[PDB]
Amino acid sequence: SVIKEEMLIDLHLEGTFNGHYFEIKGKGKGQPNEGTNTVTLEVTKGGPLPFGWHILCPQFNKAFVHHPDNIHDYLKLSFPEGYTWERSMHFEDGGLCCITNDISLTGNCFYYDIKFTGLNFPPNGPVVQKKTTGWEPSTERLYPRDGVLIGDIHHALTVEGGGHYACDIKTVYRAKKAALKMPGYHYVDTKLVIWNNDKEFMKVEEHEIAVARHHPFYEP
Amino acid sequence: VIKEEMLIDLHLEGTFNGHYFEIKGKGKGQPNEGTNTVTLEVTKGGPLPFGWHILCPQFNKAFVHHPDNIHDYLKLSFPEGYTWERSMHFEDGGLCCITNDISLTGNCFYYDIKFTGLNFPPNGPVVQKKTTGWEPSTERLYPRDGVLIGDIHHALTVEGGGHYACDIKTVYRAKKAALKMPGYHYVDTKLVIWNNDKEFMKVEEHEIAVARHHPFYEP
Amino acid sequence: VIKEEMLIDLHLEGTFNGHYFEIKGKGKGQPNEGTNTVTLEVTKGGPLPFGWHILCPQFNKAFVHHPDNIHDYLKLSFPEGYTWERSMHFEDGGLCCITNDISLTGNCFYYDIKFTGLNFPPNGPVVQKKTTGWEPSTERLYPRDGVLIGDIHHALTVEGGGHYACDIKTVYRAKKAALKMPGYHYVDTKLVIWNNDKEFMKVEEHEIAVARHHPFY
Amino acid sequence: MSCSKSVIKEEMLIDLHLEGTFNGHYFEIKGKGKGQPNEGTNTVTLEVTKGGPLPFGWHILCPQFNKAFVHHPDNIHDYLKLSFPEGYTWERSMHFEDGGLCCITNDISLTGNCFYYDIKFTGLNFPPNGPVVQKKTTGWEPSTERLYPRDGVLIGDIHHALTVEGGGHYACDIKTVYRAKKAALKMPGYHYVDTKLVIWNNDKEFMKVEEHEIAVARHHPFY
Ligand code: NA
Ligand code: NA
């Protein structure tokens, strides 16, 4: 297909957090069938950010998920046209993020047009206080509805001094052109880590590994 | 810097269930009368693949009549201005996240609005364009951490009669730290569509709003 | 069915973060005046390991003053009675789920209240007993499917000042189908603790409540 | 050697009582069963004793009818097994995609090899044309709960779903907080429990139901 074993990534993010505007540019490269990708980000406006980097990490494309042959790959099949996703993240202390990405492809490069709004984060929370230290690995549960895919994750940031900061993530993925088939109820396991950052997190390199699977007790 | 009649300039950039759209608008208000009227034009992504009315509240509580005994945090944020950030959770799973950065140059307010609407079901009143307007509302407001938090249990009216409920939280942030803060109080709002074209590409709407204490409030 | 002064007999069974408790009380009210007083005694699992105030609203909107132009769904449910079911989502993740089945025998209302309080954090104002009361409230109510839905953006006051916010939804179900429903409207309520002992084992509380349309109706 | 050491046996019995309301409708259910705590399996048979035939689909009740019956590898601390003989309580919310909300608690105690469940159920705000009231639910998908320790208690969250008649799913976000009655000595870390619950038998009107659960604890696959 148009999905190659190695593909490039060009990212743009415009965001507001507790009313503070910022922009981030990035570029990267991934291995869609291997389920891996690495991106490098640079804050281009509104930096250094007045909140912890890590809530941004999942915003910086589940086309980079390894799919076994018996799970239809809705997102890879959305190309060349592409797809959009829309995400809410409700945090245990009332913080809420609402994020969208419009993903396009030109040549062998994905283009991400990301819009981020973070709101109602308390001033003494781990995000504003920059106390988040990364994400645990996660397992997203996905199911088809109305020709789109809905994924929900019970996820958590790790916090300095040990401990977790829990979040409920919902993502809806919409192929720009009608899918001809849909996967069933399934999961994606993901692990995202920061490889590199400057002290101020103005420049960050991060890596994601992701694999789709059925539940271990699944039956067709 | 707040005058008896002021101008409104606005831009909304938005996404609804992945569909990108832009709206611009202009109008005028009477900040102390608690009234304002805006006219909006869809400039990009029209005609909208959803009912108009969810956008109405997005198109400045500086246009609220305040009595002398309720401190006016938002009017008092100017010249510097304020930002607001709002979530709207609808009874059917639909969610909107909206922001506005309000500035003032001359006697004209500028709204830089960003709208995200997500997870709206295809057969709900929004996508099916079955919303017919808003009920009037009552927002409960309280101070916290030098900012203002307001919550509404609102509802849109729907064609065949009946309501489509929503829970709205707005956080209002002055750009310069406030000297004083208001207490626990309420804003009554009534928003109406004065006119629109068939396809809702141009809409005229009017807002009347008044701040008050609870009827059983004791100083 | 409804008289100018009516008695209240109530029982509450509940758990809060796993801790079982029971409360019994009684009182009286003036359904048309929109007032009622109740006196409660913790009969089981006291002193409660959490602040009293989250329970206050659980201890009958038949005691709301309705003007001539707002159909009184809840008074008109009697003699058969009604049930309500309520959720309270607090800003720190605490959640209460409460039901009440209200019946009428003679002059006296009987409340059978079931309370579950879950996920309240240890350092929050409820567990720490830092709640000092409720603000007055405004419930928005609308009819659907022959039942009444009410929502409140409420708040408890907290020691030292400031508030602890809660979102309350109540669904009120008449036991016999209603041949008349009210429209979109509001109830204004004020609830006060009138007296308590040091450990809140015995509490008296008063409630005034009035229904109305929005001011710009 | 002491009595407390062998409180979890290879085979345990279950005796349960559930009292609940659904959209104001009162009902009671009793049940008995047995399980194999170390194998991660149990089976229970329920009978509706009051307020039946229920005016809603059975399946929302299934997870209410004890994660002591979860297979744990040696490297995941078994908080719930170790809460015994004292036992533990759990408290759960289930927020459904159409606004329906269930709040459920269970106080679990143990005598001999029999667990006793005292279950309290509240189901509210379920729409009249939703799949629960319409009895359109047909069972649960298998699930994966994410668990983490907090303040000496265990918190688990599931993004779960009921299957419904036409094909399709009815999604739910489940939170459970598990509280040992006696303060734990050690806590597990961030981990998962995979569960599959199925109906094994039922009568027409679901007045009597046999259901079976298998559950296994594990770390994330990439762990
Ligand atoms: Na809410
Ligand atoms: Na949730």
Swiss-Prot record, chain C:
Contains a chromophore consisting of modified amino acid residues. The chromophore is formed by autocatalytic backbone condensation between Xaa-N and Gly-(N+2), oxidation of Tyr-(N+1) to didehydrotyrosine, and formation of a double bond to the alpha-amino nitrogen of residue Xaa-N. Maturation of the chromophore requires nothing other than molecular oxygen. The precise stereochemistry of the tyrosine has not been determined. InterPro entries: GFP (IPR009017), GFP-related (IPR011584), Green_fluorescent_prot (IPR000786). Oral disk. SUPFAM superfamilies: GFP-like. Fluorescent proteins have become a useful and ubiquitous tool for making chimeric proteins, where they function as a fluorescent protein tag. Typically they tolerate N- and C-terminal fusion to a broad variety of proteins. They have been expressed in most known cell types and are used as a noninvasive fluorescent marker in living cells and organisms. They enable a wide range of applications where they have functioned as a cell lineage tracer, reporter of gene expression, or as a measure of protein-protein interactions. One of its GO terms (biological process) is generation of precursor metabolites and energy. It comes from the Eukaryota. Disulfide bonds: none annotated. Keywords: Chromophore, Luminescence, Photoprotein. It holds the Pfam family GFP. Pigment protein that is green in color. Belongs to the GFP family. This is GFP-like fluorescent chromoprotein dsFP483.
